[PDB]
Amino acid sequence: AEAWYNLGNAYYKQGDYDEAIEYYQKALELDPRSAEAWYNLGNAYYKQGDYDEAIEYYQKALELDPRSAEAWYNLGNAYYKQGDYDEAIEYYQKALELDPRSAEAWYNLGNAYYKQGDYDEAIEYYQKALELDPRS
Ligand SMILES: [Cl-]
Ligand SMILES: [Cl-]
Ligand SMILES: [Cl-]
Ligand SMILES: [Cl-]
């Protein structure tokens, strides 16, 4: 499983996402408990703009490792890309539970409320993002 997974990563690093997907799937066929293989398979589909597959595979990663702030944040991003702003808020909130000092998560939480027309909530979360990164 380790050699298929790292072959997938060597493709992913070059932006060869079709091949990354092929080889991550071979890794998972052999070891389906690898949170990291599911998460990176999700990432390869995300990079291709296939958000339905990204969401499916991030959800599997997070079943195996619910302490992955990165998987929560990227699941929020995949739902944001689909215009599902309440699910973006749901998963950004989980990422911030695990890393309250993530300027990126505060900012994207702000952008989900902005897309809903809740501009005062957006202001609140952009203010938190700027408390952490005043040069953004
Ligand atoms: Cl992970
Ligand atoms: Cl889940
Ligand atoms: Cl929604
Ligand atoms: Cl919160």
Coordinates of C-alpha atoms and ligand atoms in Angstrom, one line a residue:
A1 CA 0.0 0.0 0.0
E2 CA 2.9 2.3 0.9
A3 CA 4.6 2.1 -2.6
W4 CA 1.2 2.7 -4.4
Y5 CA 0.4 5.7 -2.0
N6 CA 3.9 7.3 -2.5
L7 CA 3.7 6.7 -6.4
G8 CA 0.4 8.6 -6.2
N9 CA 2.1 11.4 -4.2
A10 CA 5.0 11.7 -6.7
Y11 CA 2.2 12.3 -9.4
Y12 CA 0.2 14.6 -7.2
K13 CA 3.3 16.9 -6.5
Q14 CA 3.6 17.5 -10.3
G15 CA -0.1 18.2 -10.8
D16 CA -0.6 14.8 -12.5
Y17 CA -4.0 14.4 -10.8
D18 CA -5.5 11.6 -13.1
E19 CA -2.4 9.4 -12.2
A20 CA -2.5 10.4 -8.5
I21 CA -6.1 9.2 -8.4
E22 CA -5.3 5.9 -10.2
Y23 CA -2.5 5.0 -7.7
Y24 CA -4.2 6.3 -4.5
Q25 CA -7.2 4.0 -5.4
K26 CA -4.7 1.0 -5.7
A27 CA -3.3 1.9 -2.3
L28 CA -6.8 2.0 -0.7
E29 CA -7.9 -1.3 -2.3
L30 CA -5.0 -2.9 -0.2
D31 CA -5.3 -0.7 3.0
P32 CA -8.7 1.0 3.4
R33 CA -7.9 2.3 7.0
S34 CA -5.3 4.9 5.7
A35 CA -6.9 8.4 6.6
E36 CA -4.0 9.9 4.6
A37 CA -4.7 8.0 1.3
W38 CA -8.5 8.9 1.5
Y39 CA -7.6 12.6 2.3
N40 CA -5.1 12.8 -0.6
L41 CA -7.5 11.0 -3.0
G42 CA -10.1 13.7 -2.0
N43 CA -7.4 16.4 -2.8
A44 CA -6.7 15.0 -6.3
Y45 CA -10.4 15.1 -7.2
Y46 CA -10.7 18.7 -5.6
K47 CA -7.7 19.8 -7.9
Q48 CA -9.7 18.5 -10.9
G49 CA -12.9 20.4 -9.9
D50 CA -14.8 17.1 -9.0
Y51 CA -16.2 18.3 -5.7
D52 CA -18.6 15.4 -5.3
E53 CA -15.7 12.9 -5.2
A54 CA -13.6 15.3 -3.0
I55 CA -16.5 15.4 -0.4
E56 CA -17.0 11.6 -0.5
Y57 CA -13.3 10.9 0.1
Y58 CA -12.8 13.6 2.8
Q59 CA -15.8 12.2 4.7
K60 CA -14.0 8.7 4.7
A61 CA -10.7 10.3 5.9
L62 CA -12.6 12.1 8.8
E63 CA -14.4 8.8 9.9
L64 CA -10.8 7.3 10.4
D65 CA -9.3 10.5 11.8
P66 CA -11.8 13.2 13.1
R67 CA -8.9 15.3 14.6
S68 CA -7.7 16.3 11.0
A69 CA -8.2 20.1 10.9
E70 CA -7.0 19.9 7.3
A71 CA -9.6 17.4 6.2
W72 CA -12.4 19.4 7.9
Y73 CA -11.3 22.7 6.2
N74 CA -11.0 21.1 2.7
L75 CA -14.4 19.4 3.2
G76 CA -15.7 23.0 4.0
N77 CA -14.0 24.2 0.8
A78 CA -15.6 21.5 -1.4
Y79 CA -19.1 22.4 -0.1
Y80 CA -18.3 26.1 -0.6
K81 CA -17.4 25.3 -4.3
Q82 CA -20.9 23.6 -4.6
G83 CA -22.6 26.8 -3.2
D84 CA -23.6 24.8 -0.1
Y85 CA -22.6 27.6 2.4
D86 CA -24.3 26.2 5.5
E87 CA -22.3 22.9 5.0
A88 CA -19.1 25.1 4.4
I89 CA -19.9 26.9 7.8
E90 CA -20.6 23.5 9.5
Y91 CA -17.1 22.1 8.5
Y92 CA -15.1 25.4 8.9
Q93 CA -16.5 25.5 12.5
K94 CA -15.0 22.0 13.0
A95 CA -11.6 23.0 11.6
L96 CA -11.6 26.1 14.0
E97 CA -12.5 23.8 17.0
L98 CA -9.2 22.0 16.3
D99 CA -7.2 25.1 15.3
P100 CA -8.6 28.4 16.6
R101 CA -5.6 30.3 15.3
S102 CA -6.2 29.3 11.6
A103 CA -6.5 32.7 9.8
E104 CA -7.5 30.8 6.6
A105 CA -10.5 29.1 8.3
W106 CA -11.8 32.4 9.9
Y107 CA -11.5 34.1 6.5
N108 CA -13.4 31.3 4.6
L109 CA -16.0 31.2 7.4
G110 CA -16.4 35.0 6.8
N111 CA -16.7 34.3 3.0
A112 CA -19.5 31.6 3.5
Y113 CA -21.6 34.1 5.6
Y114 CA -20.8 36.8 2.9
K115 CA -22.2 34.5 0.1
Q116 CA -25.4 34.0 2.3
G117 CA -25.9 37.9 2.6
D118 CA -25.1 37.8 6.4
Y119 CA -22.7 40.7 6.1
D120 CA -22.4 41.4 9.9
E121 CA -21.4 37.8 10.5
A122 CA -18.9 38.0 7.6
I123 CA -17.5 41.2 9.3
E124 CA -17.1 39.3 12.6
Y125 CA -15.1 36.4 11.1
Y126 CA -12.9 38.6 8.7
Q127 CA -12.0 40.7 11.9
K128 CA -10.9 37.4 13.6
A129 CA -8.8 36.4 10.5
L130 CA -7.2 40.0 10.5
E131 CA -6.5 39.7 14.3
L132 CA -4.3 36.7 13.3
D133 CA -2.9 38.0 10.0
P134 CA -3.1 41.9 9.8
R135 CA -1.1 41.9 6.6
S136 CA -3.8 39.9 4.6
Ligands
CL1 CL -5.3 13.4 7.5
CL2 CL -17.7 12.5 8.5
CL3 CL -26.8 26.2 2.5
CL4 CL -17.1 29.2 16.5

